[PDB]
Design a protein around this ligand. Structure first.
Ligand SMILES: CCCCCCCCCCCCCCCC(=O)O
Ligand SMILES: CCCCCCCCCCCCCCCC(=O)O
Ligand SMILES: CCCCCCCCCCCCCCCC(=O)O
Ligand SMILES: CCCCCCCCCCCCCCCC(=O)O
Ligand SMILES: CCCCCCCCCCCCCCCC(=O)O
Ligand SMILES: CCCCCCCCCCCCCCCC(=O)O
Ligand SMILES: CC(C)[C@H](N)C(=O)O
Ligand SMILES: [Cl-]
Ligand SMILES: [Ru+3]
Length: 581
C-alpha cells in the first residue's frame, strides 16, 4: 500500500469514496456550509485519482490520517469558526489526529431538520438528485458526528430507494412517509445501541462486554467451537473499544479484518455467511453482523455432564474462572437462541455465585447439585411477561394497548413529565406490534432488542432531568438487571395527586381536524393528566370516563355548531367525571 488513498479508492469505488469523504469531513467541520464540503470532496477525489494512476505521485505515499488532517488545516476559517480546534494544526501526527478527535463536538447547536412536504421533496429529488441527496447526507452527518460513516451510507442508500419508488406512485405520501418514519426509527435505534455498548464498556468493564459477546456469538454460531467463539470475542472487544474511541479509519480497519477472518474460516464458524462474504468490503462486516443465527447441532446433550455431575468442576473453575463460566455461557446460549442475552447472563451469574459458595464447601457436589433448578424462575419471568403482554396486545389494539401501558406506568412513576410518559408508552406499544407477531421462540430476543433502546432513551432523558430515585437505581444498575428493575417498579403510594386544571381537560373542535396521530397524542396526554389528577381511579372507573370522552368527541365532531358542543358538553363531561372520581 504505497498509496492508501489509491487502495481505498479502488476498493470502495468513486461513488462510495465521495460519499464517505463527505460524511467524514461533515462530522468534523459541522458548521461549514454544504458547498464548502463539496469542493473539499472534489479536491480529495481528484487527488485520489492521481494516486490511482500513479501511486508514486506526490503526497500519495502519505497516510490517510495525515491527508485528512492536512485538508482540515487548509480550511481558511478554521480558527474563526472552530477556535481551539485549529490549534491541533500546530501539532504533528499522531497527536494532531488525536487532537481533532477530542474536539469533535457531539450535540452541535443546529436547528432541527424540518421534513419538507412530500411534493417539495419529490420535486427537488427529480430536478437535482445528487445535490438533494448529498445535502441531506451532509445535514445528517453534521448532526451525528459519531455515527459510523459506512452505516450512515447504508441508511442513505435506503433513503434514495424510498424516494425513487414513492415519488412516482399515485399517493406519494402514503408510500414515502411510513418508509421515512421507519428509517428514522432505525437510525435512532442504531445510534442508541452503539452508545449503549460504549458506555457499558466503560462503566461495567471489558469482562461484562466479553460475557455479552460470548452469549450473542454462541447463539449466532452454535456449530462453532468454544475456542473459535473466544477468539471472535477477543477480536470483537478490541473492535468495539477502538470504534468507541472514535477514529473512523482505525475502527474500519479492525472491522474489515474481523470480517476477513470470519469469511476465511466460515467452515469453523457458520454456514449462513456465503453471501455476506461475497459482498464488497464496504458491506461485508455489516452483513455478517445482521445475518441469521445458524441452525444448532441437533445432537446436543445436557449441560449436566460437564457442569454439575462430573468431578473436576471446582478444580476446572479455580484453574480459569472466567473461561469456565464462558464455557457454561457458550453451551447454554448455543442451545437457546430463544433466550435474551441478558437472561443467559443472569443464569451464568447464578452459576458463578453458586460455584463460589459450593466450591468452598466440604462436599461441593452436594450444594451445586440442584443449580439448574435455580434457572427455572429466571427463565419464566420474561417468558410470562411476554405471553401476557402479547395477549393484551391481541385483545386491545395497538392504541388501546398503549393506553393500558399509559395508565400502568403513570401510576408507577407519576413524577415523569406527561410528554415523556406518552412517548414511552407509545413506543412500548409498537414493540408489541412487532415482536408479538413473532412465535414464542423469537419473542424474547425481539423484546430485548427494542426494550434496550426504549430503556436507554428513557435513562438518558432521566440523567438530564431526574424525577425518581427508583428510576435512577434501575438506570445505574447493570444492563442485565435494568429491565427486571423497571418491571419490579410498583404503584407509587407517596404520590400527591396533581391539582385540577380546567384548561388541561378542555377540548375544542380542532381535535376533529387533526390526523389520527395528533388526536391520539392529544387524548393520550389527557389520559396521563387524568391519572395524575386521580391516581386512585380503577381501570373500570377510568374506562367509564374514557368511553364517555369518546362519545363526547364523536357527538361534538358531528354536531352543527361544533365549537359550542365542545364547550357545553365538555363542561358536563368534566363535572360528571369529577363526581365519579
Ligand atoms: C452513494 C451515495 C448515496 C446517496 C446519498 C443519499 C442520501 C439520502 C439522505 C436522506 C435523508 C432524509 C431525511 C428526512 C427527514 C427525517 O425523516 O428525519
Ligand atoms: C471467552 C470468555 C471470556 C470471558 C467471559 C467471562 C465469563 C462470564 C462472566 C461471569 C458471568 C456473567 C456475569 C454478568 C455480566 C455483567 O453484568 O458483568
Ligand atoms: C482525505 C482522505 C481521507 C479518506 C476518508 C474516507 C475514507 C473512508 C474509509 C472507508 C471505510 C471502510 C469500509 C468499511 C469496512 C467495515 O466497516 O467493515
Ligand atoms: C414483546 C412484548 C413487549 C411488550 C412491551 C411492554 C414490556 C413488557 C416486557 C416483557 C419482558 C421483556 C424481557 C426482555 C429480556 C430480558 O429482560 O430478559
Ligand atoms: C425519562 C424519565 C422516565 C422515568 C420512567 C418512566 C416510567 C415508565 C417506564 C416503564 C417501562 C418499563 C419497561 C418494561 C418493564 C415491564 O413493564 O415489566
Ligand atoms: C376528572 C377531570 C376531567 C376528566 C374529563 C375527561 C378526560 C378524558 C381524557 C382521556 C381520554 C382517552 C381516550 C380513550 C381512547 C379513545 O377513545 O381514543
Ligand atoms: C442518526 C439517526 C438519529 C438519524 N435519524 C438517521 O437517519 O440515521
Ligand atoms: Cl432526524
Ligand atoms: Ru433523527
Amino acid at each position: 500500500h504505497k498509496s492508501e488513498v489509491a487502495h481505498r479508492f479502488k476498493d470502495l469505488g468513486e461513488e462510495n469514496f465521495k460519499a464517505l469523504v463527505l460524511i467524514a469531513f461533515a462530522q468534523y467541520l459541522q458548521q461549514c456550509p454544504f458547498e464548502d464540503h463539496v469542493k473539499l470532496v472534489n479536491e480529495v477525489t481528484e487527488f485520489a485519482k492521481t494516486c490511482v494512476a500513479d501511486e508514486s505521485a506526490e503526497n500519495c505515499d502519505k497516510s490517510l490520517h495525515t491527508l485528512f488532517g492536512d485538508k482540515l488545516c487548509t480550511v481558511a476559517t478554521l480558527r474563526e469558526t472552530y477556535g481551539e480546534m485549529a490549534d491541533c494544526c500546530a501539532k504533528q501526527e499522531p497527536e494532531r489526529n488525536e487532537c481533532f478527535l477530542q474536539h469533535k463536538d457531539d450535540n452541535p447547536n443546529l436547528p432541527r431538520l424540518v421534513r419538507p412536504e412530500v411534493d417539495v421533496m419529490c420535486t427537488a429529488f427529480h430536478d437535482n438528485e445528487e445535490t438533494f441527496l448529498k445535502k441531506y447526507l451532509y445535514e445528517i452527518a453534521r448532526r451525528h458526528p459519531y455515527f459510523y460513516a459506512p452505516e450512515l451510507l447504508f441508511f442513505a442508500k435506503r433513503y434514495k430507494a424510498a424516494f425513487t419508488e414513492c415519488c412516482q406512485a399515485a399517493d406519494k405520501a402514503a408510500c414515502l412517509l411510513p418508509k421515512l418514519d421507519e428509517l428514522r426509527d432505525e437510525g435512532k435505534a442504531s445510534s442508541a445501541k452503539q452508545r449503549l455498548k460504549c458506555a457499558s464498556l466503560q462503566k461495567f468493564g471489558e469482562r461484562a462486554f466479553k460475557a455479552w459477546a460470548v452469549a450473542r456469538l454462541s447463539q449466532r454460531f452454535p456449530k462453532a467451537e468454544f475456542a473459535e467463539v473466544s477468539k471472535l470475542v477477543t477480536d470483537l472487544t478490541k473492535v468495539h473499544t477502538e470504534c468507541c474511541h472514535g477514529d473512523l479509519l482505525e475502527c474500519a480497519d479492525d472491522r474489515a479484518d474481523l470480517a476477513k477472518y470470519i469469511c476465511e474460516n466460515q467452515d469453523s464458524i457458520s454456514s449462513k455467511l456465503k453471501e455476506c462474504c461475497e459482498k464488497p468490503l464496504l458491506e461485508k462486516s455489516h452483513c455478517i453482523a445482521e445475518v441469521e443465527n445458524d441452525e444448532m447441532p441437533a445432537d446436543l446433550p445436557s449441560l449436566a455432564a460437564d457442569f454439575v455431575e462430573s468431578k473436576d468442576v471446582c478444580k476446572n473453575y479455580a484453574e480459569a474462572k472466567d473461561v469456565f463460566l464462558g464455557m457454561f455461557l457458550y453451551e447454554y446460549a448455543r442451545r437457546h437462541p430463544d433466550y435474551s442475552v441478558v437472561l443467559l447472563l443472569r443464569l451464568a451469574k447464578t452459576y458463578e455465585t453458586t460455584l463460589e459458595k459450593c466450591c468452598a464447601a466440604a462436599d461441593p457436589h452436594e450444594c451445586y447439585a440442584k443449580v439448574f433448578d435455580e434457572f427455572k424462575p429466571l427463565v419464566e419471568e420474561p417468558q410470562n411477561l411476554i405471553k401476557q403482554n402479547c395477549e393484551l396486545f391481541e385483545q386491545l389494539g395497538e392504541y388501546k394497548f398503549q393506553n393500558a401501558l399509559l395508565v400502568r406506568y403513570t401510576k408507577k412513576v407519576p413524577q415523569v413529565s406527561t410528554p415523556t410518559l406518552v412517548e414511552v408508552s407509545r413506543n412500548l406499544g409498537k414493540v408489541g406490534s412487532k415482536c408479538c407477531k413473532h412465535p414464542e421462540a423469537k419473542r424474547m430476543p425481539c423484546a430485548e432488542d427494542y426494550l434496550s433502546v426504549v430503556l436507554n432513551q428513557l435513562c438518558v432523558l432521566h440523567e438530564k432531568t431526574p424525577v425518581s430515585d427508583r428510576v435512577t437505581k434501575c438506570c445505574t444498575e447493570s444492563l442485565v438487571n435494568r429491565r427486571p428493575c423497571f418491571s419490579a417498579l410498583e404503584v407509587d403510594e407517596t404520590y400527591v395527586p396533581k391539582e385540577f386544571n380546567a384548561e388541561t381537560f378542555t377540548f375544542h373542535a380542532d381535535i376533529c381536524t387533526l390526523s389520527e396521530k395528533e388526536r391520539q397524542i392529544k387524548k393520550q396526554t389527557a389520559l396521563v393528566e387524568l391519572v395524575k389528577h386521580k391516581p386512585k381511579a380503577t381501570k373500570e372507573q377510568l374506562k367509564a370516563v374514557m368511553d364517555d370522552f369518546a362519545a363526547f368527541v364523536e357527538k361534538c365532531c358531528k354536531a352543527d355548531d361544533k365549537e359550542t358542543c365542545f364547550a357545553e358538553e365538555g363542561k358536563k363531561l368534566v363535572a360528571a367525571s369529577q363526581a365519579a372520581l
